[PDB]
Design a protein around this ligand. Structure first.
Ligand SMILES: CCCCCCCC/C=C/CCCCCCCC(=O)O[C@H](COC(=O)CCCCCCCCCCCCCCC)COP(=O)(O)OC[C@@H](O)CO
Ligand SMILES: CC(=O)N[C@@H]1[C@@H](O)[C@H](O)[C@@H](CO)O[C@H]1O
Ligand SMILES: *[C@@H]1O[C@H](CO)[C@@H](O)[C@H](O)[C@H]1NC(C)=O
Ligand SMILES: *[C@@H]1O[C@H](CO)[C@@H](O)[C@H](O)[C@H]1NC(C)=O
Ligand SMILES: *[C@@H]1O[C@H](CO)[C@@H](O)[C@H](O)[C@H]1NC(C)=O
Ligand SMILES: *[C@@H]1O[C@H](CO)[C@@H](O)[C@H](O)[C@H]1NC(C)=O
Ligand SMILES: *[C@H]1O[C@H](CO)[C@@H](O)[C@H](O)[C@H]1NC(C)=O
Ligand SMILES: [Ca+2]
Lengths: 451, 776, 459, 92
């Protein structure tokens, strides 16, 4: 199943599109691209520049093939989310030199009124239900599926005019909070769709934060004999899961009513739970494809393919974790001689002490992480979030750190932090694990030899 | 009213609920251990004879005791059994195991036991004069009465019917002071008390949160919650009504396996605290805590005292005393941890917003344009190109004060440096000469010209300059009239060269404010130049929240005063021990660690108070006239930052202390013992490592700073360096800082083995500690 | 009785530390770096983007000698100490045997550089000394030990002029009448500068190697030297420190002579005596180099005023490099020597006994470790020898493996050169060095420590 | 055992990062990348952005298990074997 799900190299399929849309400079004389956007004017340059160059290619109203192979499906869609004016509360002291104020994004503070030249859908709020959207969970916040949207055209000449009209009448104010661009391609050579989403966030403190997503999909599965082979293998997998859950129920029914003190029964139930969740996700995902049929009915509209990509990502994560745990389960059978038995006994005997020491190790780790977050968390950006501090410490353990960037953030208490962390991590905490393991292994081996 | 349409979270409620839950868990574990220890077994006691043979005729199996209803220890009567087991016509003369302690006052009471046959013998008393503390009397009534008629005495009237009973249940039904002062073999388990206590405190928290969050408009609408300072009618009148308003429900369980379901209810309690409290303004969340504290104090003083109106023995004693001391220490440490947590993580959202704001400010001024500057003449078009639109344009709509400009060359014009390269760091300087000047240059026409010296102010004397630093000395500018006068002023400065000539720095800094996030910021740029032309670069953006001392009773002030109280308590507690031992309080962690803890606790509050006062003073000065001055808020932006760091440090210490307290688990007590026992060998190895690291570091830097990519062939590959830098980019001639040397030495020690040597020691010690504590 | 030894060693150590700090901030690195950036970084011409660090053909070199070399030499703003010299080493036609299988289309061959195949005939227009072979003795030079070969001091040389308008004419004449034929194998350019703004003499040598397979390879060396004089009080302080150091080394050597005269029968079993003699010989050779340099520094100022003669000052640069290299290891050993005092306590005695009782086992295991190391290095040399340039020569393979041990891998060139047996080599080396072999060392030490403590019990 | 765990982690990394990071394009490339992680020669700026959840989890768990468990077990085996063989050889 895993080797079939990773077919011929779709990595190159993703990489070509990523390089076309992200690494291309927004125009000839400037060197900024989508990954290094820094202002709203740069976003406008990108929209009328590299975006149109990549979207529309030359061969009456003929279609566009991105690499002469990837067919652009329908039309791309642009969308924006903005907030209301006066949604914050300024102090009465400065209520003369400051008139307008916009808060951070939130469903309580979002705008729903027409603005500017109220002509079409680009200047009128559209509800999430009427737009068939959903949340995104961006970098700064979680944005809704509503907003002000516009559908572009199938040719470059009309899309350019539409974007120029959107730029002339001011469509991006300082009340704008987020912007989305969505489209999809097919590439009939290998039957695999691609969904492209680009997000640009405008935080209330100023600046621009870009992000992207290129997701390959497969929605016309049964085309070749290998697809039928994969379907048969999926059916066999479902039968195997049913047999395993039946056996687990039989073994939990009466025999060994407690059944939880083995650490292998827990692994088995974890595997079964993950497998049934994956099966349910797959069944709910492949049986909901009315979007494809609706698009195929009329191919001059926006193909709505984000839910499929989201569920594909979820299924991929679940399958990866399930495969990892299934492979880990192999330890239940490697006891074919006396050498592996004593190693497994050593591990099982020392686990209870390793946990007790790992509690202290992680308490000290979190103390260091919170100190780093509170001290360097506003200047370094490797410590801007708590989880980022944890990852930064794990990288410091490997030596993948830049000490100069934290030395200048704090002349004192920075070198102290680095020196103490390295010293107490490599001289004390690392060696206690070795002490425990060596004592347990020696005790087990001596006990076995003497007995 | 259904509140919370927003998504922001309040950390005060979550932190206090987590602290209370954790302290309940620790207390439950320790109290269960103590309960099992006491139930496994289930001064006033003297070592004198109890031979009471003054009468006979009461031959029966009898075993009675005494009730020493004294001060701090009032236990009931006990029983004992000997060989004859008090046979017919036998008098018991022995001492029982009673740990209660009486006093030298009228505190004595003896019970009887008449099982079956009535008593006829006259047992006077146990003749005791002075055995341990002389807390008894060798005389009594010595009379016979009905069955189980205990003789009264000192050392039925309504005025004394049950007043003595108010010395038995006084610390029994008072649920607060009853978890360590209960009599043996009671039907309370000593952890049911903790369960109902945590239920009571969580229910106070829930009631206060509900009143402040949802039911606050029916009585008075349009935002009744608008006062935080204690006016003796607010933040107090809410605690008692809440208090009382759930008191009865607490009683309902006090009357039984409902406790297993009671922990469920407490859960949903904090649930509402985690829901209705999210949309709390800062002034409301600092009064919610005060109201809860007031309700708890009222229950501890007003309602609970009104409710009550209606060998091996020595080892066990020292164990229970130690456990009581551990409970006291646990409560004190939990309160200290809660105060520190509130002081540190009250405004984490402001922390994230501050990081993002500083990044945006840096990216909006073309920071990497300013960093890569080598021409002192392009600075003027740089300022006229990106700085002027930033200050005067519609982008930075909030500015909070006009900009300003100033530098230091002293009294000596620079010279044309060689094209390309320049001086080493800042050679060919000047000094710093102070004096008035006029338009164009320092040449007065009739008197003191407008181009003054702008001497230092009262506060703000810190610039941390690489070469030299001043407070405010320089050619202060205005840059007002954003429309056109800025360019005219820049052109006039360029032409007249009043400050262009004899310059060695830039030191430009104006302001920043974010109305949405609610944070101000000070941005300062330094362009120190050795001479005319070439110059260095540096940028510093410091964001901070402008909170003032006159704002009221904000959370930082309360946390600071609580920290000061804790610091003074620790100081007096340590001084009591110091005066007890006189001198020679050395050679232990002890006082040398308590003093540092006190210093940290005092500093982390003093710096906060100082920054509050400085912010208030600077804000008043700015508000005096806002479009005339600059007001140099940077000082505040430093102090606050420093305070934050101090707080973090304090928390760090407390956190590691928690690890030290994990030794209470018997199977997990070997790691701390191993470290404490192996400390000397570790110190010796550390000394050796320090010597080796110093030697290697000064070999490596000596080899590096002697060539340009022409060091050697062997040493070019065996030379370790600090992570994050290569071999080509090193040796800064401006300053050989000690921190890169420390990094190089430590990382070279770590990469050449040399740190697994501890594994040689610890392992051995670990083995040595598993033969002396598991074998016998 | 060791108190006198400890105190005299402490005074010696603080004297050495203050001398090192005096040498620490000489600020010679920064000047040499930004003067190297003047020659090796500026574009060759206003149109080409190449520099001396990226020369790739004969034309690039010819543009360099008329361009970035001339404009950056006659104008920080240093002044010449004479006339620069340019020399060429070439081979002779027909120095190898063309195979008879294919020799009707190839007529001449030129072997790699060697003394056997060196050319000595007068080529081109026989006008001056640039077209006639002059022996090494007249040139007063030595070998250079370049990248692809070691080159003699002879060849065809020419000294330029102190005026740009004449040096440019001379090099233009050299370019017109072809001087760099197919037989050219190496080219040297040597000169010196003063830069009166900050008193620091510098000697500059540039080399361009022409392999027999085509192309060019550039190399460079800039060496600074000083003409120290008693101009302040701080230099007098360092002079007094130097005299104190001489007295200290004389003290150490005389008492070492006494201690070896009283115990000449056995003197090598102890480890600290060997370290002491190493320290004293390093100090004496360093001080000899220093006195030779300061004695010969009085001749270089003769060319400062005006002298149309080339000063050959490469020996001073070489011995200064050697002096720095000696000083580094001297301070290191005089930092190690500190380790024989800290042995005051019982725990220190146990640690020292543990370290001393396991020296032979560590030395024995080092042999096996180096055998496996050389096997892996030879494998890497045979596999990646012609592709990666981190394995071009055996010593490069050895140093690359050493860097891999310290975590300095590239793995891109390794993977590209050999898609199989490259990753196999990397994975096997990492697994067998980071999990098996390097642990064994510690194991040895571990056991010894235990044994030491054990006998304490039996004692 | 070590290689069983190594291959489980490599397959997980292949399935998760196999289409976006170019260091996990193929299974053998995943193995080589995991070997390079030990030396500390990886980006982690692409691992975190390819998958914000389950990306850092893989890295942190891999680092903790390789550095603090398996290497110490190799060292313990070597130490015990050396001490035992030397003691028995000396005794005999
Ligand atoms: C005829 C007379 C014979 C003379 C005597 C012969 C002596 C022969 C030398 C043997 C070298 C001994 C140390 C070499 C060890 C080099 C490698 C090493 O240290 O392995 C560690 C254990 O080793 C060890 O702790 C071994 C001991 C550690 C001590 C490290 C100091 C290195 C050299 C100090 C120079 C001092 C004086 C130099 C001049 C006198 C385990 O890997 P670890 O996880 O830790 O990280 C490594 C990872 O991060 C990258 O490799
Ligand atoms: C705003 C928008 O895109 N609307 C379309 C609508 O035309 C279509 O019929 C329906 C599909 O369910 O929803 C979608
Ligand atoms: C925003 O509202 C304020 C009043 O609250 C008004 O003064 C300002 O002009 C408004 N800004 C707009 C409409 O752009
Ligand atoms: C709005 O629409 C009309 C007609 O479609 C068009 O003429 C006009 O330019 C548009 N924009 C405006 C009025 O701002
Ligand atoms: C080199 O020598 C060979 C000898 O056969 C001769 O044919 C050839 O012409 C010579 N090369 C030149 C450039 O004259
Ligand atoms: C060599 O001949 C004369 C030397 O007398 C010299 O002037 C000339 O420039 C040289 N080159 C020639 C003649 O091509
Ligand atoms: C080298 O020194 C000798 C001294 O005998 C001198 O004749 C010669 O000119 C010098 N170098 C040169 C230019 O050959
Ligand atoms: Ca099972």
């Amino acid at each position: 199943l895993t080797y079939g799900m990773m077919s011929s190299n779709v990595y190159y399929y993703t990489r070509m599109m990523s390089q076309l849309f992200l690494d291309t400079p927004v125009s000839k004389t400037e060197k900024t691209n989508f990954k290094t956007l820094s202002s709203m004017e740069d976003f406008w340059k990108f929209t009328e520049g590299s975006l149109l160059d990549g979207l529309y290619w030359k061969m009456a109203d003929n279609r566009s093939f991105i690499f002469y192979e990837n067919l652009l499906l329908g039309v791309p869609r642009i969308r924006q989310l903005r907030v209301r004016n006066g949604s914050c509360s300024i102090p009465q002291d400065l209520r003369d030199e400051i008139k307008e104020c916009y808060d951070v994004y939130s469903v309580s503070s979002e705008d729903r009124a027409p603005f500017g030249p109220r002509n079409g859908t680009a200047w009128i709020y559209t509800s999430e239900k009427d737009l068939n959207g959903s949340s995104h969970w961006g970098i700064i916040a979680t944005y809704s599926g509503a907003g002000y949207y516009l559908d572009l055209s199938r040719t470059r000449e009309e899309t350019a005019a539409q974007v120029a009209s959107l730029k002339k009448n001011v469509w991006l104010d300082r009340g704008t909070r987020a912007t989305f661009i969505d489209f999809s391609v097919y590439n009939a050579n290998i039957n695999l769709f691609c969904v492209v989403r680009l997000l640009v966030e405008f935080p209330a403190t100023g600046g621009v934060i870009p992000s992207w997503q290129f997701q390959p999909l497969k929605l016309i599965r049964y085309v070749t004999t290998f697809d039928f082979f994969l379907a048969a293998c999926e059916i066999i997998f479902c039968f195997f899961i049913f047999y395993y859950v039946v056996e687990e129920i039989l073994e939990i029914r009466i025999h060994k009513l407690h059944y939880f003190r083995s650490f292998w029964n827990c692994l088995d139930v974890v595997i079964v739970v993950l497998s049934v969740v994956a099966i349910g996700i797959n069944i709910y995902r492949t049986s909901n494809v009315e979007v494809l049929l609706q698009f195929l009915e009329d191919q001059n509209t926006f193909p709505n393919f984000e839910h499929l990509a989201y569920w594909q990502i979820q299924f991929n994560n679940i399958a990866a974790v399930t495969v990892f745990f299934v492979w880990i389960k192999l330890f239940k059978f490697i006891n074919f001689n006396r050498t592996m038995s004593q190693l497994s006994t050593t591990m099982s005997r020392c686990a209870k002490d390793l946990f007790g020491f790992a509690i202290m190790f992680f308490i000290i780790f979190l103390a260091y992480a919170q100190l780093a977050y509170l001290v360097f968390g506003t200047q370094v950006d490797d410590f801007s979030t708590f989880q980022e501090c944890i990852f930064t410490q794990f990288r410091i353990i490997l030596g993948d750190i830049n000490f100069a960037e934290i030395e200048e953030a704090n002349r004192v208490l920075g070198p102290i932090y680095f020196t103490t962390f390295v010293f107490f991590m490599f001289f004390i905490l690392l060696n206690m694990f070795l002490a425990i393991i060596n004592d347990t292994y020696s005790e087990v081996k001596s006990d076995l030899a003497q007995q | 009213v259904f509140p919370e349409p927003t998504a922001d979270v309040n950390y005060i409620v979550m932190l206090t609920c987590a602290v209370c839950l954790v302290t309940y868990m620790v207390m439950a574990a320790i109290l269960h251990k103590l309960d099992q220890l006491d139930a496994s077994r289930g001064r006033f006691k003297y070592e004198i004879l109890v031979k009471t043979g003054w009468g006979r005729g009461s031959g029966t199996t009898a075993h009675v005791g005494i009730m020493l209803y004294g001060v701090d220890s009032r236990s009931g009567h006990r029983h004992l059994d000997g060989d004859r087991a008090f046979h017919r016509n036998s008098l018991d003369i022995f001492r029982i195991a009673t740990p209660h302690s009486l006093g030298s006052v009228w505190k004595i009471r003896v019970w009887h036991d008449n099982k079956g046959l009535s008593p006829a013998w006259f047992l006077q008393h146990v003749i005791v004069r002075d055995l341990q503390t002389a807390r008894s009397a060798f005389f009594l009534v010595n009379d016979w009465l009905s069955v189980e008629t205990e003789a009264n005495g000192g050392l039925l009237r309504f005025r004394r019917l049950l007043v003595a009973e108010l010395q038995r249940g006084f610390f029994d039904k008072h649920i607060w002071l009853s978890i360590w002062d209960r009599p043996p073999r009671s039907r309370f388990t000593r952890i049911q008390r903790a369960t109902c206590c945590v239920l009571l405190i969580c229910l106070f928290l829930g009631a206060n949160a509900v009143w402040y969050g949802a039911v606050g408009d029916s009585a008075y609408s349009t935002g009744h919650v608008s006062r935080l300072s204690p006016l003796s009618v607010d933040t107090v009148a809410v605690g008692l009504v809440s208090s009382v308003v759930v008191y009865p429900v607490y009683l309902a369980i006090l009357f039984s396996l409902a406790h297993g379901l009671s922990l469920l209810l407490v859960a949903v309690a904090v649930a509402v605290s985690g829901w209705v409290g999210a949309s709390f303004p800062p002034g409301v969340s600092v009064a919610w805590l005060l109201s809860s504290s007031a309700s708890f104090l009222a229950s501890f003083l007003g309602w609970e005292p009104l409710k009550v109106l209606l060998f091996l023995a020595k080892e066990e004693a020292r164990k229970v005393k130690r456990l009581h001391g551990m409970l006291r220490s646990l409560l004190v440490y939990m309160l200290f941890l809660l105060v520190t947590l509130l002081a540190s993580y009250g405004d984490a959202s402001c922390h994230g917003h501050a990081y993002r704001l500083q990044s945006a400010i840096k990216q909006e001024l073309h920071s990497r344009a300013f960093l890569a500057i080598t021409r002192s003449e392009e600075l003027w078009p740089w300022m006229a190109h990106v700085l002027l639109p930033y200050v005067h344009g519609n982008q930075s709509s909030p500015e909070l004060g006009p900009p300003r400009l100033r530098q230091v060359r002293l009294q000596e014009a620079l010279y044309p440096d060689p094209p390309g390269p320049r001086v080493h760091t800042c050679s060919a300087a000047g000094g710093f000469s102070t004096s008035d000047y006029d338009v164009g240059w320092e040449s007065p026409h009739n008197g003191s010209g407008t181009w003054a010296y702008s001497a230092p102010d009262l506060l703000g004397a810190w610039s941390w300059g690489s070469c030299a630093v001043y407070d405010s000395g320089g050619y202060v500018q205005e840059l007002g009239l954003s429309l056109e006068e800025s360019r005219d002023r820049l052109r006039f400065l360029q032409l007249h060269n009043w400050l262009d000539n004899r310059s060695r720095a830039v030191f430009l800094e104006l302001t920043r404010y974010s109305p949405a996030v609610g944070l101000h910021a000070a941005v300062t740029l330094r362009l120190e130049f050795p001479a005319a032309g070439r110059a260095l670069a540096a940028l510093s953006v410091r964001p901070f929240a402008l909170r003032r001392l006159s704002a009221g009773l904000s959370l930082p002030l309360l946390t600071s005063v609580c920290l000061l109280l804790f610091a003074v308590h620790f100081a007096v507690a340590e001084a009591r021990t110091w005066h007890r031992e006189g001198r020679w309080r050395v050679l232990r962690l002890g006082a040398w660690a308590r003093w540092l803890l006190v210093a940290l606790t005092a500093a982390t509050a003093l710096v906060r108070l100082a920054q509050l006062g400085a912010a208030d003073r600077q804000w008043t000065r700015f508000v005096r006239g806002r479009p005339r001055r600059f007001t140099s808020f940077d000082q505040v932006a430093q102090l606050s930052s420093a305070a934050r760091g101090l707080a973090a440090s304090l928390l760090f210490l407390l956190l590691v202390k928690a690890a030290q307290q994990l030794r209470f688990v018997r199977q997990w007590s070997v790691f701390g013992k191993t470290l404490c026992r192996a400390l000397p060998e570790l110190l010796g190895v550390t000394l050796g490592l320090v010597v080796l690291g110093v030697a290697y570091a000064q070999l490596a830097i000596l080899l590096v700073s002697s060539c340009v990519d022409s060091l050697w062939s062997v040493a070019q590959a065996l030379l370790v360096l600090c992570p994050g830098t290569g071999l080509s980019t090193l040796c800064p001639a401006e300053s050989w800082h000690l921190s890169p040397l420390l990094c190089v030495g430590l990382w070279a020690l770590r990469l050449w083995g040399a740190l697994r040597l501890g594994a040689v020691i610890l392992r051995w010690r670990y083995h040595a500690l598993r033969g002396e504590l598991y074998r016998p | 009785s060791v108190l006198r030894e400890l105190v005299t060693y402490l005074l010696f150590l603080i004297v050495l530390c203050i001398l090192t700090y005096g040498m620490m901030s000489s600020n010679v690195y920064y000047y040499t770096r930004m003067m190297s950036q003047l020659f090796l970084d500026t574009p060759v011409s206003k149109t080409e983007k190449t520099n001396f660090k990226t020369l790739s053909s004969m034309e690039d070199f010819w543009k360099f000698t008329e361009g970035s070399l001339l404009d950056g030499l006659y104008w920080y703003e240093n002044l010449l100490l004479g006339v620069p010299r340019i020399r060429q080493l070439r081979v002779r036609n027909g120095s190898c045997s063309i195979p008879q299988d294919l020799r009707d289309e190839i007529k001449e061959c030129y072997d790699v550089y060697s003394v056997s195949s060196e050319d000595r005939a007068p080529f081109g227009p026989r006008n001056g000394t640039a077209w006639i072979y002059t022996s090494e003795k007249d040139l007063n030079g030595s070998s250079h030990w370049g990248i692809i070969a070691t080159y003699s001091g002879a060849g065809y040389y020419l000294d330029l002029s102190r005026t740009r308008e004449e040096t440019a004419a001379q090099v233009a004449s050299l370019k017109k009448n072809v001087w760099l034929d197919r037989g050219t194998r190496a080219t040297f350019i040597d000169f010196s500068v003063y830069n009166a703004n900050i008193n620091l003499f510098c000697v500059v040598r540039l080399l361009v190697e022409f392999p027999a397979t085509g192309g060019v390879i550039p190399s460079w060396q800039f060496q600074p030297l000083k003409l120290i004089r008693y101009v302040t009080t701080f230099d007098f302080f360092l002079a007094a420190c130097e005299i104190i150091f001489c007295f200290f080394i004389f003290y150490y050597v005389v008492e070492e002579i006494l201690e070896i005269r009283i115990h000449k029968l056995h003197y090598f079993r102890s480890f600290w005596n060997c370290l002491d003699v190493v320290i004293v010989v390093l100090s004496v050779v360093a001080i000899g180099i220093n006195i030779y340099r300061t004695s010969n520094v009085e001749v270089l100022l003769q060319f400062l005023e005006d002298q149309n003669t080339f000063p050959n000052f490469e020996h001073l640069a070489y011995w200064q490099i050697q002096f720095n290299n000696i000083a580094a290891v001297t301070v290191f050993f005089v930092w190690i020597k500190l380790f024989k005092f800290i042995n005051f306590n019982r725990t220190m005695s146990q640690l020292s006994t543990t370290m001393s009782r396991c020296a032979k086992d560590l030395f024995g295991f080092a042999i096996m470790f180096f055998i496996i190391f050389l096997a892996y290095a030879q494998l890497a040399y045979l596999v990646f020898g012609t592709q990666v340039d981190d394995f071009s020569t055996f010593q490069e393979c050895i140093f690359t493996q050493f860097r891999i041990i310290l975590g300095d891998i590239n793995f891109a060139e390794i993977e590209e050169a050999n898609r199989v047996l490259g990753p196999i080599y990397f994975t096997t080396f990492v697994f067998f060095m980071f999990f098996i072999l390097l642990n064994m060392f510690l194991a040895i030490i571990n056991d010894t420590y235990s044994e030491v403590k054990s006998d304490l019990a039996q004692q």
